[model samples]
Target: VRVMKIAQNKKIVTVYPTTTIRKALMTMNENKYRRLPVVNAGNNKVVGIITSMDIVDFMGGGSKYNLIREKHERNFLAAINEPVREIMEENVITLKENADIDEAIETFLTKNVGGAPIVNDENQLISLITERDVIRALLDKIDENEVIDDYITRDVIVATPGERLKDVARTMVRNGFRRLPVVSEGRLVGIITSTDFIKLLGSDWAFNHMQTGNVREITNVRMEEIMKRDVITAKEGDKLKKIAEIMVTNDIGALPVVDENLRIKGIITEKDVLKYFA
Candidate 1:
């Protein structure tokens, strides 16, 4: 299938180069997007891309010591006023409307990007194509006899049910992970994701109370309070096609791979699945 067939026809949400980081972050949180295409404020031409990770890294107060003690509040306050263009990645990899599915997959794998903005002849952004879209295309086009164990990541980073939310967010920002499996008593009980953290930004109390002044309050929130308790998992023996179907249907990026006893064996992410096409 061609990318044009699977690409969403929805209007693209974009950020202007001059837009403040605060507005960009709000737009992304409200729209449930991980990244936004940056356009020329004058011509509306795609020029760059900005991701959630970029914002987090900008606000990082160095090590845990700095985050807890010295400059956390000051750095975060200053970053919100900074222009988006300062951090937006230039020389973006884009997909044409007529490009083949394999071309998109190859670009994603080779570039290691979460998604690419689709462009028209004038290099105007039309819509975005993400790893989820690539996964969906592959799920419909092929089937495989291979089990997930072959591609699953054995070395996984996880969080405990009682773990601090700030710690989990820091881990995600550091590793570029969208989700973390919550393990307790050696069993996967729930999951926390970047989206969950984004949702917290929507709360007025959280935005005003914790983020501006009380760094301790942000760290005080527990993962169990915010995590999704009902989880979808895959076993080591599950077929690649079935795993893809589950991910496509559920709209999730990663699944924790478990043994017959529901113990965490490994994890299969969209990046891992894309490796086959690479």
Candidate 2:
């Protein structure tokens, strides 16, 4: 199937290079988006793109934090007021109007980006597409003859309720994990993802804390305060089609596979299911 047929003809939300990091974070939270295209205001031409991961990086979890350290000297207020161009990914891997679906799908994985803005020959921004969009469009194409058990990652990395956001963010960015299961006493209790980071960063509570010059206080929050307790899970017997449906419908990127006894057994991700299209 063609790629354009996958994206809805809706108004796309984007940020200009002049947009402040604080404003960009607020925009992401308002739209429930994991990423946003950076475009020229007058021409709407793609320049760069920012993802939740990049936000995490700038918030003291990864290399981008160096920008804060060197430029802002770890001052939360000063750092966030700077233009978003300071931290956005300049080397964006875009989905072209005439690009093949498989080629574009490979681009997402090879470039380690969850999604991208689609542009035409003129390099003008058009629609935004994500793994969820692809899964919904190509849901019927997934092989239903097999279960996700054989394809799921058997090993799982879990977190604790008392862990700090700083710790979790570091692990996620350094190890490239989008989601992590929270376990205490060997039982699953909650889940944290990159989306959670964006939400916290955009919240009044976090912003207020930063205003108090307690920048570390934001990342010092306990996992339990920010984790999603009403997490959706899956079983080992579930099929890829069913898994993809759950992910798209719930707007989650990964699921922790559990046993009949409700014990965590493995994990599945959007990237994992995208292998079918690859």
Determine which window of 10 residues in candidate 2 has minimal summed lDDT: 95-104
lDDT of 2 by residue, 1-278 (tens): 56777776898899999999989988998887768899999799999999888888788779989877888888877888999999998877888886667866887768777787889987899887787888788888887875887668887888889999988889888887878999888777889988888888778897788878768888899899999987788888888999998888887889888876668888888887888766
Per-residue lDDT value at 76 in model 1? 51
State the displacement of the C-alpha of residue 182, model 2, in Å, after optimal TM-score superposition: 1.5
Question: Could you tell me how far off, in angstroms, the CA of residue 169 lies in candidate 2 after the best superposition?
Answer: 0.7
lDDT of 1 at 158: 92
Once fitted onto the true fold, the runs of candidate 2 whose alpha carbons sit more than 4 angstroms away are 143-145
Each model's backbone clash number? 0, 0
lDDT of 1 by residue, 1-278 (tens): 67878887788789998898778888998787778999987777899998766654444411422432344354554546667877677898999878888888888877778789988888888788988888886775555786677789998899899987667767777777768899998889899887676566557757686556653465567889889988888888888888888887887889998877779998998878877676
Looking at model 1, residue 64 earns an lDDT score of: 28
